[PDB]
Amino acid sequence: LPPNAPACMERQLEAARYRSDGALLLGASSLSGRCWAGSLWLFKDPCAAPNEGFCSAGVQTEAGVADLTWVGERGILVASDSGAVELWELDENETLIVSKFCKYEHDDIVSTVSVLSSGTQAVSGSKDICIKVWDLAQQVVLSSYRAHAAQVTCVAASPHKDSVFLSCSEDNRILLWDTRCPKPASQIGCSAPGYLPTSLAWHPQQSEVFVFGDENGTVSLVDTKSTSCVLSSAVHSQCVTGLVFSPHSVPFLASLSEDCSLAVLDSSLSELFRSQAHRDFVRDATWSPLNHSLLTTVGWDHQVVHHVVP
Amino acid sequence: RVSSGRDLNCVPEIADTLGAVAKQGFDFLCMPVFHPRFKREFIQEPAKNRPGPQTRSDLLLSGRDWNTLIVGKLSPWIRPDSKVEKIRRNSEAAMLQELNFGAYLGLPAFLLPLNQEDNTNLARVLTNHIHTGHHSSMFWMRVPLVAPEDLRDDIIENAPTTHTEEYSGEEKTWMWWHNFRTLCDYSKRIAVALEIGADLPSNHVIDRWLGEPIKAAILPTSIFLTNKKGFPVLSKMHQRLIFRLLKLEVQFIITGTNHHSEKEFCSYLQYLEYLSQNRPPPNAYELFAKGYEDYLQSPLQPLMDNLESQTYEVFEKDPIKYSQYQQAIYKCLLDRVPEEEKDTNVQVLMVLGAGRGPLVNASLRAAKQADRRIKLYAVEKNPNAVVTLENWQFEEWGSQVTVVSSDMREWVAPEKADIIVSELLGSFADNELSPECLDGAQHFLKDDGVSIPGEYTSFLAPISSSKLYNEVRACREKDRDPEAQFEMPYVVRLHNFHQLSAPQPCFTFSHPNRDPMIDNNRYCTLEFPVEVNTVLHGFAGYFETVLYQDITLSIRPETHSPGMFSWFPILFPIKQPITVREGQTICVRFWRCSNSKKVWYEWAVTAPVCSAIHNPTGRSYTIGL
Ligand SMILES: CSC[C@H]1O[C@@H](n2cnc3c(N)ncnc32)[C@H](O)[C@@H]1O
């Protein structure tokens, strides 16, 4: 048990992210009980998670963590329940996690964060309906955007373009953004409302296609240049809370859900793997950089599962 | 001076947070009772069987603190009106679960959002909770002045914000509230928590909320401008609005994070205290009326009933009113007795309905001020007040004043009067039956005698106010017609209301009445042009009276007698609120009817829709003759 690391780790795991070298980042919140807070953990041994005594580093936040993302190899970007976007930075020894900035710019729970391609900027989405573009170097907001009409559910930065990112919201809009245009946002997707979009994943190869899941368990594949929704599949029985593409050259798509299941999909959205390992909500997923068929999932049942993918 | 609370969506430890917001000056805290992101499943395994505890414990605060300091908040994932059947069901169980925990804790209010048009299933679950336990909890519906869709930045290239005016579309959130509260049957436990945005809408949108039960205004930190020194402050237009809300004694709620980082959080709160202490002070009328705002009282019937001592006491502590009476008598003596007769001619003056004698004294002060000689009869049928009169005339007035303990329609006078004086007027002028009383008395006025008052006219003005409709609704009584409270006027210091058209004269009476066929029944048709969308809940009644020539009294607002608080307006409610669209005409019909035994009124609306004829034949309300 490293110093400054809590003796116990909050029951509700939100985030699970593998760094370049294969170390596991864990975000957790306390969503019940006397104290509602959160913590950030680093597990250089991924098979030792979730155990608190076998971690490389850990720290406590003031409030829960709703979304998480790496910022390079030592930075950790946190969406807080406090309305703060937080940047934590790893130790030089990589045995502590030290707060870098805590900026209260949102007026409600920050629900989603995503780093832009340069790694020097990020976009956060919140329940206050605003979307903000940050300078991680300066620790300030560059732009604040009220494009949506309800809470922002997900913001996904473009893989290779600082200017471009997706957002979606409970106002049923999927917005493709490009801060180069004077009206930066652009409403895309089908004209029929469908169901509320809940998760977005850019495609890692074809920088003009993305996938989005909805609150009705459907996953959809979309080209930002041609026509309208070419492909979709009913993968889940409840909301789709996450979509993660595998590192493979022809990538696989991981699909998370409140129906407590994981699914792995190919390029045509057909079903390959399916896992019932979780007994509560499946919250995040990351593929291992080292072994590309290993797939980690965390959930509110406090399980960290490691899947082998055929 | 300002009751205010802090809205948070993140409470890591309830004990510290409450102390931090208590420290910053706040009177109460609005917080989640479950964690805002803790979506719960009730139907589908395994998530259904999520080990507890489902939230934090009630032992963390005292019952006193729960009861007075904590406003619950509905979790934002609860969506009873989702297009997804699974989400509709989970949210129903979740909303009941959360409302029951709120009632379990004794919370004084619980907040719920109106953030879309269709909240039908939301209303149904709330209605189904209200009818389970018969509690006293309040429910503050969080409604924005401006829907977020009508407020978004114009930054979607292929979906621009319309730059045309849409008069009714800009009122849409009032219709969210209005449907929601109709569906729920005008529960008194369901109020408005009006949320105020950075840019206010046109006045007409803000005026849709006149007459609504606003219990709280929500001010985000976003909307506070910054002054030179760096404090948070508000635009002149927001300040106008805060001033209007202060007259409604709403509780202000501050939501959002601190955006004036150099300063602390008292500064927001302090600005309101600044605006509060810095408003025009209440005039003499508004001091008298504090505590009577929208308070329903029955109209006095001084003919049929013997008024109590303290009732005459309030009649008398209105000096403005007797100044006017004195002056009306003064001017009248001079017109009737020339200077060269000031000692040969003695005017016989009769106070008809003398009470405890404030008019008897006003007449004496008037005949001294005018230096003329008068002979005074004090007529009063209330024998308890005649006790006061006869003690006054023995101790002071002497044989100048003859107290007459009689009904003026019975009294056989020994001689005729030059002047009869009376204060027989109600808030609707003739509603205390002064026409009937002065008619039975005019046979002993001289053929050239004056009556003071000489004329009076009533007035009427359609109003909107759901707050008074509900109050009237609450007045159901056992052993009478269950709608009877809607067929009968009420004296009330009208406060949280919207006046829909300018007052317009209804019934006029002149004294002495020189008809060979005296008839005090009436029929009057009025058309009120309405230039707003609104909902009609009844009619405001006022009156004017000519005491003598140019000396008048009025409670018509346009010409109100300054400083005189003897009459609040009168309210004539209707059974069924009527929707009225911009540019339409409110047509109302008013009858004065009578027996040998009863006078009464009857009224209908006939445009833009018909209402029932109210109080037909005096079934619900008479004035006794
Ligand atoms: C000062 S309010 C009116 C007063 O006039 C009295 N009054 C009303 N009607 C009559 C009447 N017909 N005859 C005599 N006094 C009356 C009432 O008892 C009350 O004191």
Q: Compute the nearest-CA separation of A36 from chain B (Å).
A: 4
Q: Is B423 a catalytic residue?
A: yes
- The residues pairing with B43 across neighbouring beta strands, listed in sequence order, are none
Ligand 1 contacts CB of residue B381 (under 6 A): yes
Residue A83 contacts B where some CB pair is shorter than 8 Å: yes
Gap between the Cα atoms of B489 and A213, Å rounded: 60
Stretch(es) of chain B classified as CATH 3.20.20.150: 1-287
* Residue B105 half-sphere exposure toward CB, CA atoms < 13 A: 29
Chain A CB contacts of B258 below 8 Å: 104
Q: What tokens does B34 get?
A: 């479950």
C-beta separation of A32 from B53 below 8 A: yes
Return the closest-CA partner of residue B6 out of B23, B555, A298.
B23
Gap between the Cα atoms of B222 and A129, Å rounded: 13
Gap between the Cα atoms of A6 and A58, Å rounded: 7
Ligand 1 contacts CB of residue B380 (under 6 A): yes
- For B530, left (φ over 0), alpha (ψ -120 to 50), or beta? beta
C-beta separation of B574 from B538 below 8 A: yes
Gap between the Cα atoms of B38 and B77, Å rounded: 9
Of B47, B76, B153, the CB nearest to A260: B47
Residues contacting B224, CB < 8 A, separation 6+:
B232, B233, B234, B259, B260, B268, B271
Of A129, A183, A215, the CB nearest to B157: A183
Stretch(es) of chain B classified as CATH 2.70.160.11: 455-625
Stretch(es) of chain B classified as CATH 3.40.50.150: 288-454
Mutation pick from A30, A36, A61, A300 vs chain B, by most beta carbons of B within 10 Å, is: A36
Residue B510 contacts A where some CB pair is shorter than 8 Å: no
Of A107, A173, A258, the CB nearest to B39: A258
Matching CATH number, B455-625, of 3.30.390.10, 1.10.1040.10, 3.40.50.720, 2.70.160.11? 2.70.160.11
Q: Which residue has the tokens 């009818």?
A: B131
Q: What is the dihedral of CA B158, B164, B170, B172, to 10 degrees?
A: -50
The structure was resolved experimentally with: X-ray
Ligand 1 contacts CB of residue B307 (under 6 A): yes
- From the list B170, B195, B212, B423, the catalytic residue is B423
Residues contacting B147, CB < 8 A, separation 6+:
A149, B172, B173
C-beta separation of A65 from A111 below 8 A: no
At B417 the three-state DSSP class reads strand
| CATH fold of the domain at B288-454 | Rossmann fold (3.40.50)
> What separation in angstroms does the CA of B508 have from each of B302, B434, B513, B592, B615?
21, 12, 11, 11, 21
Gap between the Cα atoms of A242 and A255, Å rounded: 6
Residues contacting B608, CB < 8 A, separation 6+:
B578, B579, B580, B581, B584, B585, B586, B587
Farthest CA pair distance, chain A: 55
Return the closest-CA partner of residue B307 out of B254, B255, B383, B411.
B383
Burial classification of residue B314, based on how many CB atoms lie within 10 Å of its CB (0-12 exposed, 13-18 middle, 19 or more buried): exposed
Hey, what domains does chain A have and what are their CATH numbers? 6-310 (2.130.10.10)
> What separation in angstroms does the CA of B465 have from each of A301, B443, B462, B580, B604?
52, 45, 10, 13, 18
Gap between the Cα atoms of A299 and A287, Å rounded: 15
At B505 the three-state DSSP class reads strand
Gap between the Cα atoms of A49 and A9, Å rounded: 11
Residues contacting B399, CB < 8 A, separation 6+:
none
Q: Compute the nearest-CA separation of B36 from chain A (Å).
A: 8
Query: Taking CA atoms, what residue in A is nearest to B258?
Result: A104
Quick check: A32 and B220 CB within 8 A?
Answer: no
Q: What tokens does B203 get?
A: 């006045």
Residues 81-120 of chain B whose Cβ lies under 8 A from any Cβ of chain A: 82-84, 86-87, 115
Gap between the Cα atoms of B376 and B378, Å rounded: 6
Return the closest-CA partner of residue B77 out of A11, A309, A215.
A215
Listing DSSP states for B470-494 in one string gives: HHHHH---TTS-TTGGGSS-EE-B-
Backbone angles phi, psi at A147, to 5 degrees: -90, -35
Helical (H) or strand (E) element with B624:
strand B623-624
Q: Which residue has the tokens 């790694």?
A: A119
C-beta separation of B84 from A240 below 8 A: no
Q: How far is CA B238 from the centre of its chain?
A: 24
Backbone angles phi, psi at B90, to 5 degrees: -55, -40
Return the closest-CA partner of residue B155 out of A171, A162, A176.
A176
> What separation in angstroms does the CA of A278 have from each of A84, A256, A259, B12, B87?
30, 11, 10, 27, 21
The alpha carbon of B422 and the centre of ligand 1 are apart by a number of angstroms equal to 8
> What separation in angstroms does the CA of B112 have from each of B26, B122, B150?
21, 9, 21
Considering the segment(s) B1-287 as one domain, its CATH architecture is Alpha-Beta Barrel (3.20)
**Judging by DSSP bridges, how do beta strands A84-90 and A12-18 pair with one another?**
unpaired
Residue A101 contacts B where some CB pair is shorter than 8 Å: no
Q: What tokens does B79 get?
A: 């969506």
Amino acid occupying residue B160: P
> How many Cβ atoms are within 10 Å of B517's Cβ, its own excluded?
4
